[PDB]
Structure 1
Amino acid sequence: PKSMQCKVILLDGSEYTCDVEKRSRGQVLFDKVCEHLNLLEKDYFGLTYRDAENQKNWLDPAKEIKKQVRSGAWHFSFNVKFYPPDPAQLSEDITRYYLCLQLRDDIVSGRLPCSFVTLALLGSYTVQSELGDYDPDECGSDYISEFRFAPNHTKELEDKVIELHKSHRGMTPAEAEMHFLENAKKLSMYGVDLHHAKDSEGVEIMLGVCASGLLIYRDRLRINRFAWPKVLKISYKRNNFYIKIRPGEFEQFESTIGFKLPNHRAAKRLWKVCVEHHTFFRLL
């Protein structure tokens, strides 16, 4: 039996290495990673890899790893795939913990925009969870934390983190993580996977895929929202991605909205993530 070495970037930034038989399906590797992480609530998570364009793709657990990664290194990242709309309802604290680590990267990367105050409050719960109670000995007026809190750090943000940290005395890691999640879950881009596309008139838009449905971000004025119940059908033809919407209260027939993606692969990627998210909605 010939086995390929796999390297997986974990959400703390560390690297897990293991081997799987070269014709292994993605589920085999994913099961090894989740056992390493002591993670039972595995359905919210998945593995990604980067193609020769360094675009992120979901490893399909049902298909051979080799057929997916094709010519690339067997190098993967462990990630949240389906962001729970109510993290309080997860059965395990360790699940909430990995969700926190993913959200911390969502914030630092700018995928999850956040007000100054929310950056500081989230940062304060992270510090409380990671270091425990506020200690003045480690923090002077000049203090800068090792923790990355934001896409751009300022001394003002570091000060606000410390001020809110002082208020969390006695909070345990699981409690601080639950508070982190209660705040993060409310942010407008929480759990939203964004895809570049053009509308039928060729105007640049963004399509967001999340638990609740599909978002079309046309401009700061006019964000189209299609709850899953409203989406009849989704399709991809060549580079074209089409959404069919149930008849409105004044339509007799469904409406078809068409989008142009960069290439055929980007259309197929968007279709698959939409199908997978809709099934998630169906089981909520």
Structure 2
Amino acid sequence: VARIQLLNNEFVEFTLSVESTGQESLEAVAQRLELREVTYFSLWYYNKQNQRRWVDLEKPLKKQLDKYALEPTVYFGVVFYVPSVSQLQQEITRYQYYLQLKKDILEGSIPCTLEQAIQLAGLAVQADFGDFDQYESQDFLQKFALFPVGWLQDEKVLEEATQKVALLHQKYRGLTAPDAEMLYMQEVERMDGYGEESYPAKDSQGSDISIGACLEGIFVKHKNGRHPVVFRWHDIANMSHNKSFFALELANKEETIQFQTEDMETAKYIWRLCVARHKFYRLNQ
């Protein structure tokens, strides 16, 4: 009854029961991939406004899609990001993680400079194509584009960037795909934006902010940029949602912090992901 886009961008049709949960569908994908470390992963969909929303894994999936999704398609992905990918035990887990981190770079959720894009491309081509070959390299320049279509609009810049990636590819001769993938993920893990999911909100004064979860806790960014704040997981005594508001209680403060979101439903969703991430980093730390 279902369509899932995997991290390799392949669409698979999955025939599951009527009232089967999001967890059940997640487990069937994992079984297909022979993925054993499923806890890092989940499924998301485009809602009726085409905003991405992770599924509620403990509820029937059909009814979630019937009610909130424009189309009955879900997407496999990483919901819980680790501080160090060496914590991932099996190669299949690491490969799936690697595909997700590449998508985060391609989609700009983890911004990168041109230099960073070049260095990452160098490891990725070794991971994805094996050892450099002078003939396959020139063929590649015709088959595919190395950088996303809008990143380098300047012909000479694109050419020098591409040649630099080629030189790095040659320097990585002999790296196995799992090793190249690990080096790639070890660089992406130290990049700003890694493991962050943000949402618009307003603070108690009416100012526009970005709030979200990061490796270290709940963060608040003001348009200032002058002072970003993180409430570390260990310091958060409680979290709640009520109508459009998402709220934090800190252990060291009898003053709770309130964030106004767009929706009652958005507040509930943000609260749910923040609670799940708090639980994860409690276990993982």
Matched-pair contact (CA < 8 Å) for 1:145–1:158: no
Letter of the aligned partner of 1:8 in structure 2? I
Deviation for aligned residue 1:33:
0.9
**1:185 Cα offset (Å):** 0.6
Aligned residues: 275
Among 96, 99, 111, the residue aligned to 1:98: 96
Kindly provide the amino acid, as one letter, of the partner of residue 279 in structure 2.
Answer: T
- What is the Cα deviation at residue 25 of structure 1? 1.2
CA deviations on 1:226-257 (whole Å, 9 max, x unpaired) are 1101111111111111112222xxxxx43322
From 42, 45, 58, the equivalent of 1:46 is 42
The normalised TM-score by structure 1 is 0.91
More displaced, 228-237 or 139-148? 139-148
Give the 3 Å change call, closer, same or farther, for CA 275–148 of structure 1 in structure 2.
farther
Contact 1:211 1:278 in 2 (8 A): no
Q: What is the percentage of aligned positions where both structures have the same residue?
A: 32
The aligned counterpart of 2:155 is none
Return closer, same or farther for 1:194/1:148 CA change in 2, 3 Å cut-off: farther
SS in 1 for 2:256: strand
Pairwise CA RMSD: 1.9
Counterparts of 1:212-227 in structure 2 under 5 Å? Answer: 212-218=216-222, 219-227=224-232
| Greater percentage in helix | 2
**Alignment match, 2:134:** 136
Deviation at 1:120, TM superposition (A): 1.3
Contact 1:120 1:161 in 2 (8 A): yes
Matched, 1:258 2:258: yes
8 A Cα contact 1:82 1:211, kept in partner? no
Structure 2 counterparts to residues 87-236 of structure 1, below 5 A? 87-140=85-138, 143=141, 146=144, 149=147, 152-153=151-152, 154-218=158-222, 219-236=224-241
* Cα separation, 2, equivalents of 1:31 and 1:262: 32
Cα distance, 1:127–1:144 mapped onto 2, change above 3 Å: farther
Partners in 2 of 1:138 and 1:119 — Cα distance?
21
In structure 1, distance between residues paired with 2:204 and 2:99: 38
Q: Is the 8 A contact 2:4 2:74 kept in 1?
A: yes
Q: Contact 2:240/2:246 (CA < 8 Å) preserved in 1?
A: yes
Q: Secondary structure at the match of 1:206?
A: strand
2:77 equivalent to 1:74: no
Q: 1:233, 1:245 within 8 Å by CA — same for their partners in 2? A: yes
> Higher mean Cα deviation, 110-119 or 13-22?
110-119
Find the aligned partners of 2:146 and 2:42 in 1 and give their Cα distance.
24
- One-letter code aligned to 1:152: W
The runs of 5 or more residues in structure 1 that have no matched partner are 248-252
* C-alpha distance after superposition, 1:15-59 (max 9, x if no partner): 010111111111221111111112111100001111211111222
Shift of 1:140: 4.3
CA contact (8 A) 2:119 2:168 kept: yes
Is the CA contact 2:146–2:162 (under 8 Å) kept in the aligned structure 1? no
User: What's the secondary structure of 2:134's corresponding residue?
Assistant: coil
Q: How far is the alpha carbon of 1:12 from its aligned partner?
A: 1.0
Distance apart, 1:146 and its partner CA: 3.0
Relative to structure 1, the CA distance from residue 254 to residue 167 in structure 2 (aligned partners, 3 Å threshold; closer, same or farther) is: farther
Note if contact 1:8-1:16 (Cα within 8 Å) is conserved in structure 2: yes
Aligned to 1:238: 243
Match of 1:35 among 31, 34, 53: 31
Q: 1:60 to 1:100 in 2, by over 3 A?
A: same
**AA partner of residue 18 (structure 1):** F
Distance verdict in 2 for CA 1:142–1:271, change over 3 Å: closer
Per-residue CA distance 1:101-153 (angstroms, 9 max, x = gap) = 11111111111011222211211111001111111223349937736555614
Q: CA deviation at 1:193?
A: 0.7
Q: Which runs of 5+ in 2 are unaligned?
A: 153-157
Per-residue CA deviation, residues 179-229 of structure 1 (Å, 9 max, x unaligned), is 001101101210101111111122211112123211111133211011101
| Corresponding residue to 2:15 among 19, 30, 35 | 19
Map of 1:269 onto structure 2 = 269
Q: Specify whether residues 142 and 90 from structure 1 end up closer, same or farther in structure 2 by C-alpha distance, changes over 3 A only.
A: closer
